[PDB]
Amino acid sequence: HHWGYGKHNGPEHWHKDFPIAKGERQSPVDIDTHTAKYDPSLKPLSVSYDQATSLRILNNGHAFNVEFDDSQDKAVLKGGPLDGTYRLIQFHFHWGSLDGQGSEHTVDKKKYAAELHLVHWNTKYGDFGKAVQQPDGLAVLGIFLKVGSAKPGLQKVVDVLDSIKTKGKSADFTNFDPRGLLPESLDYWTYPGSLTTPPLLECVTWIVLKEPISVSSEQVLKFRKLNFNGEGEPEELMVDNWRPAQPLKNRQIKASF
Ligand SMILES: NS(=O)(=O)c1ccc2ccccc2c1
Ligand code: NA
Ligand SMILES: [Zn+2]
């Protein structure tokens, strides 16, 4: 009886195994655009993904992760609200059963169709597993997806999904360039929060871009054909793999713009 996204194991149950689920800095949150504070001290986000080395894509049973080589300073995030340098380890998405839901963060209660999380760890902690034990260990860049025009830079990911349909499947995924997933603007909101799946650790500086990317209906429909089950088990479509907004608990969300 492990956690996942249902009536009996979904987000409202997670606190029994991970009591930090009711903590002081949980994610996601609703971003109240009118109450977010413009902070002139915030710097442009520096996203330096030229040398990224995509290795593999994995169906982990909750989402799919596109993995990177994080054994050298290659793809790194810095600037923004960050001190120091954060290495890209993986990205994944959360999405809905319907276009009207799927994002984790919300904007004035608006839910997007999906949300991309580019996960980075602070190089001062030496690797990811140590970083998650620190309050400034991770920086997750969140990007909303809306359904409209296709995102051409997403298609390589969509087309490999049939090869990783079920939990535990992986496939080689080299030369994937995550720059093709970024909107034009890097304007952002930021706040201190947590992992949005167990273990829900309170180790994340969230950086949520204001500008969404457009993906096609056909692209998100392919997300929705993935499976949360493993091969040889009854089919459970991988949909609605998002945690609802959690209490802000008087954290301030700061705007770069
Ligand atoms: N969804 S999220 O907050 O970006 C996220 C990112 C990295 C994770 C690594 C392990 C467990 C949970 C994780 C959650
Ligand atoms: Na369409
Ligand atoms: Zn995530």
From Swiss-Prot:
SMART domains: Carb_anhydrase (SM01057)
Effect caused by changing G142R: In OPTB3; complete loss of activity
Binding site for Zn(2+): H92, H94, H117
Required co-factors: Zn(2+); Co(2+)
Active site: H62
Outcome (variant: A63S): 2-fold decrease in enzyme efficiency, as determined by kcat/KM ratio, and efficiently inhibited by chlorzolamide
One Gene Ontology cellular component annotation held by this UniProt entry: cytoplasm
GO biological process terms, semicolon-separated: angiotensin-activated signaling pathway; carbon dioxide transport; morphogenesis of an epithelium; neuron cellular homeostasis; positive regulation of cellular pH reduction; positive regulation of dipeptide transmembrane transport; positive regulation of synaptic transmission, GABAergic; regulation of chloride transport
Function: Catalyzes the reversible hydration of carbon dioxide. Can also hydrate cyanamide to urea. Stimulates the chloride-bicarbonate exchange activity of SLC26A6. Essential for bone resorption and osteoclast differentiation. Involved in the regulation of fluid secretion into the anterior chamber of the eye. Contributes to intracellular pH regulation in the duodenal upper villous epithelium during proton-coupled peptide absorption.
This protein's name: Carbonic anhydrase 2
